[PDB]
UniProtKB/Swiss-Prot annotation, chain A:
PROSITE patterns noted in UniProt: RIBOSOMAL_S4 (PS00632), S4 (PS50889)
Family to which the UniProt record says this protein belongs: Belongs to the universal ribosomal protein uS4 family.
Residue ranges constituting the S4 RNA-binding domain according to the UniProt record: 95-155
Keywords: Antibiotic resistance, Repressor, Ribonucleoprotein, Ribosomal protein, Ribosome biogenesis, RNA-binding, rRNA-binding, Transcription, Transcription antitermination, Transcription regulation, Transcription termination, Translation regulation
Molecular functions per Gene Ontology: mRNA 5'-UTR binding; mRNA regulatory element binding translation repressor activity; rRNA binding; structural constituent of ribosome
CDD domains named in the record: S4
Highest rank taxon of the organism: Bacteria
Protein name, entry field: Small ribosomal subunit protein uS4
Described function: One of two assembly initiator proteins for the 30S subunit, it binds directly to 16S rRNA where it nucleates assembly of the body of the 30S subunit. With S5 and S12 plays an important role in translational accuracy; many suppressors of streptomycin-dependent mutants of protein S12 are found in this protein, some but not all of which decrease translational accuracy (ram, ribosomal ambiguity mutations).
GO biological process: cytoplasmic translation; DNA-templated transcription termination; maintenance of translational fidelity; negative regulation of translational initiation; response to antibiotic; ribosomal small subunit assembly; ribosomal small subunit biogenesis; transcription antitermination
Organism (species): Escherichia coli (strain K12)
UniProtKB/Swiss-Prot annotation, chain B:
GO cellular component: cytoplasm; cytosol; cytosolic small ribosomal subunit; small ribosomal subunit
Keywords, alphabetical: Ribonucleoprotein, Ribosomal protein, RNA-binding, rRNA-binding
Superkingdom assignment: Bacteria
Database matches in Pfam families: Ribosomal_S20p
HAMAP family according to UniProt: Ribosomal_bS20
Organism listed in the record: Escherichia coli (strain K12)
GO-annotated biological processes: cytoplasmic translation; ribosomal small subunit assembly
Family: Belongs to the bacterial ribosomal protein bS20 family.
Region (Disordered): 1-24
Protein name: Small ribosomal subunit protein bS20
InterPro entries per record: Ribosomal_bS20 (IPR002583), Ribosomal_bS20_sf (IPR036510)
Job of this protein: Binds directly to 16S ribosomal RNA.
Lineage per the UniProt record: Bacteria, Pseudomonadati, Pseudomonadota, Gammaproteobacteria, Enterobacterales
UniProtKB/Swiss-Prot annotation, chain C:
Keywords: Antibiotic resistance, Ribonucleoprotein, Ribosomal protein, RNA-binding, rRNA-binding
Oligomer and partners: Part of the 30S ribosomal subunit.
Chain ranges passing through the membrane: none
Protein's name according to its UniProt entry: Small ribosomal subunit protein uS17
Family (UniProt): Belongs to the universal ribosomal protein uS17 family.
GO cellular component: cytoplasm; cytosolic small ribosomal subunit
Further facts: The strain missing both S17 and L29 grows very slowly and has a rather unstable temperature-sensitive phenotype.
InterPro entries in the cross-refs: NA-bd_OB-fold, Ribosomal_uS17, Ribosomal_uS17_bact/chlr, Ribosomal_uS17_CS
One Gene Ontology MF term: structural constituent of ribosome
GO BP term, example: ribosomal small subunit assembly
Length: 205, 85, 80, 82
RNA sequence: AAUUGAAGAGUUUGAUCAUGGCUCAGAUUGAACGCUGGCGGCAGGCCUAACACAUGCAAGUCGAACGGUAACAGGAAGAAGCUUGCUUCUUUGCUGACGAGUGGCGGACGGGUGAGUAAUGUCUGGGAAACUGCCUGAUGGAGGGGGAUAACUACUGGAAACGGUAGCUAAUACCGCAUAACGUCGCAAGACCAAAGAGGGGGACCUUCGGGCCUCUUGCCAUCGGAUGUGCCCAGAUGGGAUUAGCUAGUAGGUGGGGUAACGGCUCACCUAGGCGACGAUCCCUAGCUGGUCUGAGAGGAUGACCAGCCACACUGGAACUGAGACACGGUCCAGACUCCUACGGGAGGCAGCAGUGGGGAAUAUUGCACAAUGGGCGCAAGCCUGAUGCAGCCAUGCCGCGUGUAUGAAGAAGGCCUUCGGGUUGUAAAGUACUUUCAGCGGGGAGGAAGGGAGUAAAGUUAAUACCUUUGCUCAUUGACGUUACCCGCAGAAGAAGCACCGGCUAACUCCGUGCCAGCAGCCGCGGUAAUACGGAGGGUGCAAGCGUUAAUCGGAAUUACUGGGCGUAAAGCGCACGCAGGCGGUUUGUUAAGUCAGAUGUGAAAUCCCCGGGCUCAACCUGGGAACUGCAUCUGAUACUGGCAA
């Protein structure tokens, strides 16, 4: 029900940093990125069309830490909502509670944020939410409880929040350790390199 | 079978007997009427019709003939006597 | 008013009764073609005025025999 | 007899009762003539918990309908407004 | 706001293009099987043998209808050990109550199953010739008598089941008599038709001093309405077969008699000789139908498990009786097959209610708890009953959610596998280090489903009455099966928690070793006869994940039945050619109609489900509010271009 394995291996099959070990240090430096996703990893794949579509879906799931039935349900919900299904799908992945806890700098990675969410260290709107996939509405206040406030992790995580780009659709404020999800993220406000038409076309075959 | 169905069995037998007797007397009076119409007798059949009328209305009221049937009888028989008289 | 139908006499020979074919003109559910379609009805008439090949209007009433729940109102167009 | 009565429709350990007008010898969640309101015994402490069409209820009691003890309790709860 | 909706590929050939079949990639399931398996929420769970059933429950209730006392607990009276003050025993239905019985109501609901039924069914829309317990409104009546019969007692038959005979008693049981309509018959005149009391309380009066009498509540009867439910009719629609073309004598219609609640060949007598049928009758095979479900871009195709509406069935075949309602699942009668008891004379039974067995099968669950809620029956109510229902148990059967940690960590450790022996890879993976405690485990706290019901008051209404009863407030104890509940807090420690398939192409993911046309694999193409990316193992990777594969089944892809949306010179496909009936289509102008067509309105298209916008469960699944939708049918109002009818 979640991955639990070598993370930088997943980041190495995709060829791109999936932010799976954000943590203390800088850019990887001990990954052997691009070089060998397994034993025959030095081989160029010469990847197919199914391979590029598949590999795009796997990039997105392995970023946000979602498995397939849950992702597939996000595609069905993004499909039925009015508008653009790629952009709706990223809006559904960005409203996840573990993601919003990661974006605010409360967790160093999304797995650490998922353990903060999971171990009842996070309230939304003054109610404790235990669930990684809670869908944070706009104009909500998500914060850390009094237990697990001033624990080392979150402090260190806010320390590495300043190294990243400070997302526009949040009120990050780390003094009180509370945040406000203000609006839904625009497609132009996130990541610029994921090709969601490939995963629309992957599920539409 | 072991219940209050035994009581409904015995009551329905008792009421079967009662209703069979009253139903049989009613039918014999109506046979008096259109068995007097079998011969060309006007006032004999009118006497029999006056003899059957209270019992057919009465068995309609008691609940075993369901009064429309009551009406039919007297209606049909009235027709017979003014087919005759 | 009353709901009535129009049709033509298809046969005649029965003892104070008649039988009338009705032409409903209904679209096919799959193919979208308007197709003629009949409905033969045993229709009552007192004193059997309408003969074969007529056109007659017809209303629904109580049952008068087996099938027969229909009775005429107006004989039109008898022309031989 | 026609009865204005409740009919259990929510999930397990979470009932939502819909008050209907049924011929009384039908099943509980079976055939009804018309539904006329609802009653959620939880709902949350928000706004309603219960709405209930008093005009149609007065129509059916005018016709001869009977009312169960809960529906009588709900009409005694929502009296005219509160 | 409520349709944002459509993918291909492999294989005919030396190669090609086309045709064309086969096959694969998706979604789904009441699933089964194999390997594996942590938790929870919500659902689902005999698809086969409508096979046979042990055992326990599944329908009772009312003494405020009645005679009554079998118990239980009191009361009165008597007698006794007598502690002259408490026990023991006895007569009394005197009382709260109540076994058995009569009687009223319910056992036609609820619950099960899908055998039969291809149209006496179902769906949609009309209709007329109807009945309707309980419930409600209105108008009125509710007077006066009689004979019985259970129970009971006494005999008595029978192994039992079950009876018989003779007496006794009651009623809201039964029967007359009176009374009689805006009721039935009748054109009228007229004729005729019913009933039942019980309970609470009481000032005065009368008491045969039991109670009359007054009042209230409730019940009875008659008629007309209403609501609900049911019966009947019509039209359209709802499988396959023409290698099934004729079927039908109560058959088709009429008249009259009978019958039903009601029309009707429903039935009978007579008369006519019809009726149905290629727009598919009749026969045969199959089948419960629908809202819906699955698939689909859609049109369609398949299906109709759960949930809900309708029908049918209740061991098998038939029949009626009682009743408002049945031709009756836990009723009666007969017959039959099976099983059982027997004293051999005869008797008894019916899980397709809920659990459960045996069998059958690839396959499907506990002989649980409670009536606390919702509903039902009975009752004035209290309450009693409820295997409906609420819940719990078992099962990864499905859907949904969460977990198996998190960060750091290069000596790129050891070991495995490969190696062009340089190294590469497993791999930040592990170990180390630093944190976190979800869920499981342990200990505390603790909502909500609980509204009612009971006991006292106070006021109002009624009344002769400050009683009784009804209604409304107030107060007082209370009412939870689930349930060591949901949820909250604290404890200890990463501590209890990852498999399954695949890796030649389709199709994401590669090498080594073993085997050598073998062993074996395979959905199709096809691999294997010595260096096999296809077999078996290992390392590595890929996909899914408490699941994963295989199998079965459906739709898709399949434009390979083509209505949307195909073809026919040579690929399959133009009758050998004509004439022509039914059928289909029909030049051109004007007028009328308005059937098709179009527009609007109204009634209906059950609720749930799908869709949209919201709301509640920490979220989700789930539940839910409002709308849209249900593409239809009927009626009314219009328009008249096109099609049809009619006239020229």
């Amino acid at each position: 029900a979640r991955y639990l394995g070598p993370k930088l291996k997943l980041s190495r099959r995709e060829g791109t940093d999936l932010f799976l070990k954000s943590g203390v240090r800088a850019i990887d430096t001990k990954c052997k990125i691009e070089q060998a996703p397994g034993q025959h990893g030095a081989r160029k794949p010469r990847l197919s069309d199914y391979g590029v579509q598949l590999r795009e879906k796997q990039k997105v799931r392995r970023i946000y830490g979602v498995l397939e039935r849950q992702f597939r349900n996000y595609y069905k919900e993004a499909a039925r909502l009015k508008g653009n299904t790629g952009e709706n799908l990223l809006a559904l992945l960005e409203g996840r509670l573990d993601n919003v806890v990661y974006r605010m700098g409360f967790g160093a990675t999304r797995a650490e944020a998922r353990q903060l969410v999971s171990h009842k260290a996070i309230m939304v709107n003054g109610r404790v939410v235990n669930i990684a996939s809670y869908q944070v509405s706009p104009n909500d206040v998500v914060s850390i409880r009094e237990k697990a406030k001033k624990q080392s992790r979150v402090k260190a995580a806010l320390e590495l929040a300043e190294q990243r780009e400070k997302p526009t659709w949040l009120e990050v404020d780390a003094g009180k350790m509370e945040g406000t999800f203000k609006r839904k993220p625009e497609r132009s406000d996130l990541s610029a390199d994921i090709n969601e038409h490939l995963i629309v076309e992957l599920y539409s075959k | 079978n072991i219940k209050s169905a035994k009581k409904r069995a015995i009551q329905s037998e008792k009421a079967r007997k009662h209703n069979a007797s009253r139903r049989s007397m009613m039918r014999t009076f109506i046979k008096k009427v259109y068995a007097a119409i079998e011969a060309g007798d006007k006032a004999a059949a009118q006497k029999a019709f006056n003899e059957m009328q209270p019992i057919v209305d009465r068995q309609a009221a008691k609940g075993l003939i369901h009064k429309n049937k009551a009406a039919r009888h007297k209606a049909n028989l009235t027709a017979q006597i003014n087919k005759l008289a | 008013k009353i709901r009535t139908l129009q049709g033509r006499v298809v046969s005649d020979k029965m003892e104070k009764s008649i039988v009338v074919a009705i032409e409903r003109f209904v679209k096919h559910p799959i193919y979208g073609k308007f197709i003629k379609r009949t409905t033969k009805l045993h229709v009552h008439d007192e004193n059997n005025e309408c003969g074969i090949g007529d056109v007659v209007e017809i209303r629904e009433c109580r049952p008068l025999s087996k099938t027969k729940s229909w009775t005429l109102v107006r004989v039109v167009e008898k022309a031989v | 007899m026609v009865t204005i009565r409740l009919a259990r429709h929510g999930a397990k350990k979470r009932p939502f009762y819909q008050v209907v007008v049924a011929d009384s010898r039908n099943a509980r969640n079976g055939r009804f003539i018309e539904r006329v309101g609802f009653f959620n015994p939880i709902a949350s402490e928000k706004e309603e918990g219960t709405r209930l069409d008093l005009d149609r209820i007065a129509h059916w009691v005018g016709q001869g309908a009977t009312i169960s003890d809960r529906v009588a309790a709900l009409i005694k709860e929502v009296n005219k407004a509160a």
